[PDB]
Amino acid sequence: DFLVHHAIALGLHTTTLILVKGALDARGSKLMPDKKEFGYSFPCDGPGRGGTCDISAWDAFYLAVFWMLNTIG
Amino acid sequence: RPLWFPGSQPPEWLDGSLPGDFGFDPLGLGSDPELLKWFVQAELVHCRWAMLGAAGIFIPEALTKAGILNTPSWTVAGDQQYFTDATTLFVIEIILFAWAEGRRWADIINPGCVNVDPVFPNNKLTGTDVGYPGGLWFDPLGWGQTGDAAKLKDLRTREIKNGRLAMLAVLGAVVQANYTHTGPIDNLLAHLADPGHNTIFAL
Amino acid sequence: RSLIFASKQSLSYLDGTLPGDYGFDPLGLMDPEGAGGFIDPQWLPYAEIINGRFAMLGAAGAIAPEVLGRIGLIPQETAIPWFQSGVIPPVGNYSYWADPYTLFVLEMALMGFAEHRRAQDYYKPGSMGKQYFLGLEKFLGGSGNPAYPGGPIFNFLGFGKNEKELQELKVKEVKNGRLAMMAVLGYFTQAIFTGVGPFQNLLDHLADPVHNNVLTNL
Amino acid sequence: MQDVKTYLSTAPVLATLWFGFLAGLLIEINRFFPDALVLPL
Amino acid sequence: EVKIMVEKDPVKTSFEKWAKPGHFSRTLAKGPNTTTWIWNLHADAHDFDSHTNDLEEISRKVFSAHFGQLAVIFIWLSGMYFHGARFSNYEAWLSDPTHIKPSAQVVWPIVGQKILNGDVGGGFQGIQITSGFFQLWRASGITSELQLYTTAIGGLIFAALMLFAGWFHYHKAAPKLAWFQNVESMLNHHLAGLLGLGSLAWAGHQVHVSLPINRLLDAGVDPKEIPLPHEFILNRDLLAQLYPSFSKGLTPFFTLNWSEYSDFLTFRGGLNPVTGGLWLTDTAHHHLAIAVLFLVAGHMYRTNFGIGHSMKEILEAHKGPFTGEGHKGLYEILTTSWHAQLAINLAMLGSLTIIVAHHMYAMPPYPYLATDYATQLSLFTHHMWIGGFLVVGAAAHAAIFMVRDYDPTTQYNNLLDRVLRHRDAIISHLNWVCIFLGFHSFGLYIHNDTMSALGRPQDMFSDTAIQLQPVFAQWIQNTHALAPSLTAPNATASTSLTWGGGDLVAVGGKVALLPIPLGTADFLVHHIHAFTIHVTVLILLKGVLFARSSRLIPDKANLGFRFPCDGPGRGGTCQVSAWDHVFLGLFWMYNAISVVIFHFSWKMQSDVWGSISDQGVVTHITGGNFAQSSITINGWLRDFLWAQASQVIQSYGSSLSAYGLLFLGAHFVWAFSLMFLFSGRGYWQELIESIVWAHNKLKVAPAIQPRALSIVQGRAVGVAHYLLGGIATTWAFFLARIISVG
Amino acid sequence: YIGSSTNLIMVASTTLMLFAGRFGLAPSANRKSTAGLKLVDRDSGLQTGDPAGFTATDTLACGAMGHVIGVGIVLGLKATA
Numbered sequence A: 001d002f003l004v005h006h007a008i009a010l011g012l013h014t015t016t017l018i019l020v021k022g023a024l025d026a027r028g029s030k031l032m033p034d035k036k037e038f039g040y041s042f043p044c045d046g047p048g049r050g051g052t053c054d055i056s057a058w059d060a061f062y063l064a065v066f067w068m069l070n071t072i073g
Numbered sequence B: 001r002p003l004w005f006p007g008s009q010p011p012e013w014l015d016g017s018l019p020g021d022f023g024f025d026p027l028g029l030g031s032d033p034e035l036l037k038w039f040v041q042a043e044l045v046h047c048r049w050a051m052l053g054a055a056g057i058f059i060p061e062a063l064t065k066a067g068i069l070n071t072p073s074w075t076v077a078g079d080q081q082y083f084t085d086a087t088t089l090f091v092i093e094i095i096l097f098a099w100a101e102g103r104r105w106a107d108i109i110n111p112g113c114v115n116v117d118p119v120f121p122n123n124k125l126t127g128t129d130v131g132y133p134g135g136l137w138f139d140p141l142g143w144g145q146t147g148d149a150a151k152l153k154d155l156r157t158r159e160i161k162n163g164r165l166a167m168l169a170v171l172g173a174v175v176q177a178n179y180t181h182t183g184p185i186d187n188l189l190a191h192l193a194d195p196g197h198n199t200i201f202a203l
Numbered sequence C: 001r002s003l004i005f006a007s008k009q010s011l012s013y014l015d016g017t018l019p020g021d022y023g024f025d026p027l028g029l030m031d032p033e034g035a036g037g038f039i040d041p042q043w044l045p046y047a048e049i050i051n052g053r054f055a056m057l058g059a060a061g062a063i064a065p066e067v068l069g070r071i072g073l074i075p076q077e078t079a080i081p082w083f084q085s086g087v088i089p090p091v092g093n094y095s096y097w098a099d100p101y102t103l104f105v106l107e108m109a110l111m112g113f114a115e116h117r118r119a120q121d122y123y124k125p126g127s128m129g130k131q132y133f134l135g136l137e138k139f140l141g142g143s144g145n146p147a148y149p150g151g152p153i154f155n156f157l158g159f160g161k162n163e164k165e166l167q168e169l170k171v172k173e174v175k176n177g178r179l180a181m182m183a184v185l186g187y188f189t190q191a192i193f194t195g196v197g198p199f200q201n202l203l204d205h206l207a208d209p210v211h212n213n214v215l216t217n218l
Numbered sequence D: 001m002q003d004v005k006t007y008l009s010t011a012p013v014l015a016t017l018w019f020g021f022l023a024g025l026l027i028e029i030n031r032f033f034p035d036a037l038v039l040p041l
Numbered sequence E: 001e002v003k004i005m006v007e008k009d010p011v012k013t014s015f016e017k018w019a020k021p022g023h024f025s026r027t028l029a030k031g032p033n034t035t036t037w038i039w040n041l042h043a044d045a046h047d048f049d050s051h052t053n054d055l056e057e058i059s060r061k062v063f064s065a066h067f068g069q070l071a072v073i074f075i076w077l078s079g080m081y082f083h084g085a086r087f088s089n090y091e092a093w094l095s096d097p098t099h100i101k102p103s104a105q106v107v108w109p110i111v112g113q114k115i116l117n118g119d120v121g122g123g124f125q126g127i128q129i130t131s132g133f134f135q136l137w138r139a140s141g142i143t144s145e146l147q148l149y150t151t152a153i154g155g156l157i158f159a160a161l162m163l164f165a166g167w168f169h170y171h172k173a174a175p176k177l178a179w180f181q182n183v184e185s186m187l188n189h190h191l192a193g194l195l196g197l198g199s200l201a202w203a204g205h206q207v208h209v210s211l212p213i214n215r216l217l218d219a220g221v222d223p224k225e226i227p228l229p230h231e232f233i234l235n236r237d238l239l240a241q242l243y244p245s246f247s248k249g250l251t252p253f254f255t256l257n258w259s260e261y262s263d264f265l266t267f268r269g270g271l272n273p274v275t276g277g278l279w280l281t282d283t284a285h286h287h288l289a290i291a292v293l294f295l296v297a298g299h300m301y302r303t304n305f306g307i308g309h310s311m312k313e314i315l316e317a318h319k320g321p322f323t324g325e326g327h328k329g330l331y332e333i334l335t336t337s338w339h340a341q342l343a344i345n346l347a348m349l350g351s352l353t354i355i356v357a358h359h360m361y362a363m364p365p366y367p368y369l370a371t372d373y374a375t376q377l378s379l380f381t382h383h384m385w386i387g388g389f390l391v392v393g394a395a396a397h398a399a400i401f402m403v404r405d406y407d408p409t410t411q412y413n414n415l416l417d418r419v420l421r422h423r424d425a426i427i428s429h430l431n432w433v434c435i436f437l438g439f440h441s442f443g444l445y446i447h448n449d450t451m452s453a454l455g456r457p458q459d460m461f462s463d464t465a466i467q468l469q470p471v472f473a474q475w476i477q478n479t480h481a482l483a484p485s486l487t488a489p490n491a492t493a494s495t496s497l498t499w500g501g502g503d504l505v506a507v508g509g510k511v512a513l514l515p516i517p518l519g520t521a522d523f524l525v526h527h528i529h530a531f532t533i534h535v536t537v538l539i540l541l542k543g544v545l546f547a548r549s550s551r552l553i554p555d556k557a558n559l560g561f562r563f564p565c566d567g568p569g570r571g572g573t574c575q576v577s578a579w580d581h582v583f584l585g586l587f588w589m590y591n592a593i594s595v596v597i598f599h600f601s602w603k604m605q606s607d608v609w610g611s612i613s614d615q616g617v618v619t620h621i622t623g624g625n626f627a628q629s630s631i632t633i634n635g636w637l638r639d640f641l642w643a644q645a646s647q648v649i650q651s652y653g654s655s656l657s658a659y660g661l662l663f664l665g666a667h668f669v670w671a672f673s674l675m676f677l678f679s680g681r682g683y684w685q686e687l688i689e690s691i692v693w694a695h696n697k698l699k700v701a702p703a704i705q706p707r708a709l710s711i712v713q714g715r716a717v718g719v720a721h722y723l724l725g726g727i728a729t730t731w732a733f734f735l736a737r738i739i740s741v742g
Numbered sequence F: 001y002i003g004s005s006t007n008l009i010m011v012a013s014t015t016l017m018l019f020a021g022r023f024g025l026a027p028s029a030n031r032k033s034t035a036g037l038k039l040v041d042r043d044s045g046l047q048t049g050d051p052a053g054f055t056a057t058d059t060l061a062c063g064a065m066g067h068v069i070g071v072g073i074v075l076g077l078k079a080t081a
């Protein structure tokens, strides 16, 4: 029960990690400062500047749906 | 200049200034000048420990075969019982060699700094070269401090070449004990009887 | 000017300055266009010399204890074929003063003091007669061509003083050299097929040649 | 050794030499002191 | 014109180029500036075409890399013979192999892992090996571990020779470009010198060493009293007592009385009833025939002796009215591009390894190979995975040839230009046959699952429901069983036991082989196999054909091979690259090869592998459930993935518990793959920006800037963990189940 | 064995193929067959004493086709007659 409660705390903490990261890097970040002017659910920003796949806040929600599924699983 | 491989060109880092220099560096590990001075210092204490090693392996076992002394074999000499346990014989030696080799560690790094006795400052070592400390404790006869440099280089060359024969000998005594399970004086007398057959291929 | 088994690729580099320059190179091995480490025109004539002289010491040496045993000049214990003489201890082992594994270490110690000196004269001629070697390093200097040193030791009768005489005699060395390599290769295949020494193979063929050839005997 | 020791000081070699020493140490701790669940000191 | 072109000392053997890591690439020679430099350091390490534009130095790099690979394989073989010599029970297994399991790995007793040294038999503790080395050494005639140690030190000698040759052919005498472009000589010396003389030398070993020792091993003679292999060569009467045809002594070979060699050169067929492995009189006649046939085929091409073929003259005379100027320039393709030859060689080596897998479960070449079921499952599974990886790499280097070595000026109106000219037709008709195969195999499985779920067993595709009997396979198996009587006279028995010629071979109370039935279940799973192979061909051939350009991106060849995308334009151009098609074909190779080895494991655990009791009754491992449960996905999940996984999960506390640990850790690596596959770079880059902020706060910022992995690199890491985790899952489940029930 | 059928075939298979390679009936080193099976002359570079162009390669090549064909005729007639 101790070990799976730390699994639960891992799940809530990592889902909160992706979701707080999506909510607070929603307007912009150091990779792309104008994320607010591209809307919420934009796909990417192109292969330039290293690569900007899943840069949007909707994509952090997308990656944290897997983490809520793993958490509640 | 005598060289180990008379057709080969001698290496640039081995200029013949070192004692016992015969240009033998096929792997070239002494190419760095800072690492060459460490390796010459490594070869000096290797030579003198092996000559002290060869006088405790081949000298008393020859006296054991001749019946002069009843000392055990060199392989089973550490297994014998003494007044001090062999586990705590090491930490006495480690403490005594933290002053012997640790003060030797400073001479390789900083030359001419540990040549003064700390208890009595009037006592000092009459040595100017790294690896050859001199003084009364190490050169009580004064043969290593000569005015001429050609005789001094040959005497240091005589020290190195006597050393590297023993580094072949103590390594030779290790593998002979692993292969024949017999003392190297007894391996010599077995080889002195029939040298055609009593060899490494006698199995 | 005898020329056999030649091609226009082969005569581009075999111009006749060699002793055994008969033009025989169908594969194109002494080509100077792709000269490398061991396939090059500087090592390959010198490789045929050392393989020739070891085969002339080999073809004569593998038949001499068998010929001398039939005429009665050596004891019959040493009058044995070459393969059952400690070389291959499966087909036969003869007891010398040492076992052949110790004798091999004595071999490569003396070959290592003889062929390392022969090696470094090829890479640079005359560079070995400078370091001290038993007071005899002056005679071991060699010529520019490393196959023929011709010093006071390797030419100690001085036979072949004239340049025209020595060059024509070099042709007789390689032609006797090449015949000895085919003899030792001939000695090797007869030792496996017939299983008996080469002088017995000559004596068996000289009695009944139509019943003791290669086709009848395996 | 101006460049051989530079290669020996690279990131994969020094990770192999440290973790070879690190796993070499922790295995030899786990031989003379095995099954260690509670630190007694 | 074929002759040796080398040149002396191209690069000096120095360690100053070892110290600079990115010396081969101009971009990496400036040193690191981000953490992506480390990944492009390894990504461009072997990519020799991206280093230099000179094909001569590229070919020298490839030749010395081949020698380094040969050194690595000889070090590996040295290890496996040293493990047989010192850390095995090969003499104990060789005394009696029907009760002692093959084991050649001893672990150290350190942390509780000494339970992995299990009771394999013969008074020995160790990891039970499944690599088949013990049966291979029994087929080689190896009797003692001194011979294994001699082969290990000889392999170490050859590994030092390959290292010396790799140094020699890059730093002392490296060949020039026209030496590597002599492909006629290379084929002449690979067909005759390598595969012909290699088969001839192994035929000589299997005449003198393998055959009499393995004949004495069939007689129950103890291997410590069996005469040594050179005693048959020396004492030929000892060789003649086992085969009287040796008493004639090489005179029937040169007088064409080869039928007098019928004592030891036979066309028997089938398996040895003593051991369960092929006959070595047949394996020696096989090697003598493929040697007298590869040496004939090695005298085909024109080097410099007048006779032969210029293969450009073979190609340029092969032109047809449906193609026009076909086959022209393909010699210039295959002699100026290493990737095109790599594509062909990788396709042949992968397909050949798949041939090896089928021709070893079916015709087991080694004594007691078939009855040791762990060896058979592991050898088939290993060669299927290697073959699938090599055919995906074949399509990879085909695509790299298109993006980096395909010159359109030299290829006009040939076969390759016209294949590019109708690539929409190829990919669309392949797409149609893939969708048709997907419905007509997997929807048939879904139909069987649905009517078995709905309580309609008569509405299914069973052997009792609507039958789908493979009449072509069931006829070709009868044609291969009823062959010796009329179409292949001179055969004592038939080629394989799995054809239908009877001969229930029982070795050690365990079934070696018998007639393999083919029913509705085999039809369904073979159509699954054809479907999955076709879809893997579809992604891979789409990446080869659309490597140059597409309707979407007409300048795709300028973007390269390992580029992620063009961008979010044209609706989104994600995974347009040919690399991404190799990346997806790796998953489809997982799907294809995993269903192949699953069909293999269930098909022979249900219909082949088992035991024979008295009065000729055969009890299989999972008795007869392939014909009824392998037609539904619930049977595959239930009677294969659940019933046979009841030995990988309760192996804990035993010697097979490392298979349980790697089963679970393989699930871990697979779910770790789903982190890299499903995510993208920019999220991880901004998360790393937050971590870099936390490092800036505590002044522990590295000067090498932490970066997220690249999109090509993130897909590469995801597919590497997906293949590693899933393949290790199947490896652990297979090697726990078939060791436990074997 | 001299008058046996194995010797008479293998002599005649080797002799007729060497006759074909010398008298311009078979492909050799100095004459090439095209796709139309027409003998066209070439310079392979190999020099022997034959005025026709027969070299040391062809006496090994036609000896081999004297032997590859000749083995098959002997063992073909051994299984049949």
Ligand code: CLA
Pocket (backbone or CB within 6 Å): E063, E066, E067, E070, E161, E179, E180, E182, E183, E185, E186, E189, E190, E192, E193, E194
């Ligand atoms: C009859 C001569 C002959 C034979 C036997 C081979 C054999 C081989 N070649 Mg080679 N080759 C030759 C001549 C020959 N070559 C010619 C004439 C050309 C020039 C046009 C090439 C150019 C060529 C290249 C460019 C490469 C090879 C490679 C290969 C290797 C195949 C890969 C492998 O794993 O095989 C199985 C491997 C083995 C069984 C190992 C055997 C190694 C031993 C020491 C023999 C090799 C030395 C030599 C070729 C033959 C000496 C015979 C000796 C036993 C008496 C193998 C060593 C490939 C390779 O791996 O490069 C290193 C490679 O791509 N070949």
Ligand code: CLA
Pocket (backbone or CB within 6 Å): E042, E043, E044, E045, E046, E047, E048, E342, E346, E389, E390, E392, E393, E394, E396, E397, E400, E561, E562, E579, E582, E583, E586, E720, E724
């Ligand atoms: C005969 C074999 C062969 C040949 C010669 C090559 C040669 C090459 N490949 Mg490859 N290829 C092949 C077969 C082969 N491959 C197969 C088997 C596949 C399918 C996977 C492909 C797919 C393919 C693609 C997708 C691409 C290449 C490319 C490359 C090039 C350089 C790659 C590099 O620098 O290494 C880099 C090496 C590594 C990163 C090592 C990682 C090894 C794997 C991926 C992970 C570890 C696996 C290991 C078994 C698990 C251990 C885990 C443990 C440590 C915990 C080079 C031309 C690349 C290129 O640009 O070509 C020009 C590239 O884009 N290959």
Ligand SMILES: CC1=C[C@H](O)CC(C)(C)[C@H]1/C=C/C(C)=C/C=C/C(C)=C/C=C/C=C(C)/C=C/C=C(C)/C=C/C1=C(C)C[C@H](O)CC1(C)C
Pocket (backbone or CB within 6 Å): B024, B025, B026, B027, B028, B029, B030, B045, B046, B047, B049, B050, B052, B053, B054, B055, B056, B057, B073, B074, B075, B077, B078, B166, B167, B168, B170, B171
């Ligand atoms: C230089 C070079 C050059 C390049 O670099 C390359 C190379 C090759 C690398 C090189 C070389 C090298 C080498 C040869 C090495 C080796 C060494 C040695 C052997 C040492 C020993 C060394 C040795 C040593 C010190 C020794 C020591 C010893 C001792 C202490 C002993 C002791 C003892 C005694 C008394 C007796 C008793 O009862 C016991 C005991 C206790 C036991």
Ligand SMILES: CC1=C(/C=C/C(C)=C/C=C/C(C)=C/C=C/C=C(C)/C=C/C=C(C)/C=C/C2=C(C)CCCC2(C)C)C(C)(C)CCC1
Pocket (backbone or CB within 6 Å): E292, F014, F059, F060, F061, F062, F063, F064, F067, F068, F071
């Ligand atoms: C000088 C002269 C002459 C002569 C010539 C001649 C006579 C020739 C000969 C030649 C010959 C006569 C040749 C032959 C050759 C042979 C060969 C080249 C062989 C090869 C072989 C092989 C190829 C192999 C074999 C086989 C087979 C086939 C099968 C299986 C088995 C075996 C492997 C064994 C005359 C008189 C005209 C005139 C004057 C001058």
Ligand SMILES: CC1=C(C/C=C(\C)CCC[C@H](C)CCC[C@H](C)CCCC(C)C)C(=O)c2ccccc2C1=O
Pocket (backbone or CB within 6 Å): E675, E676, E677, E679, E680, E681, E684, E685, E707, E708, E709, E710, E711, E713, E714, E715
């Ligand atoms: C996790 C993840 C990352 C981040 C991955 C990173 C940063 C790799 C981490 C590698 C190691 C763990 C860091 C480097 C380790 C150093 C060698 C230092 C050693 C420290 C310990 C390992 C000893 C991506 O960049 C990415 C990109 C595209 C799609 C998916 C993903 C993705 O899922």
Ligand code: SF4
Pocket (backbone or CB within 6 Å): A043, A044, A045, A046, A047, A051, A052, A053, A054, E564, E565, E566, E567, E568, E569, E572, E573, E574, E575, E680, E711
């Ligand atoms: S690969 Fe990345 S950059 Fe390209 S379209 Fe997809 S998400 Fe956008």
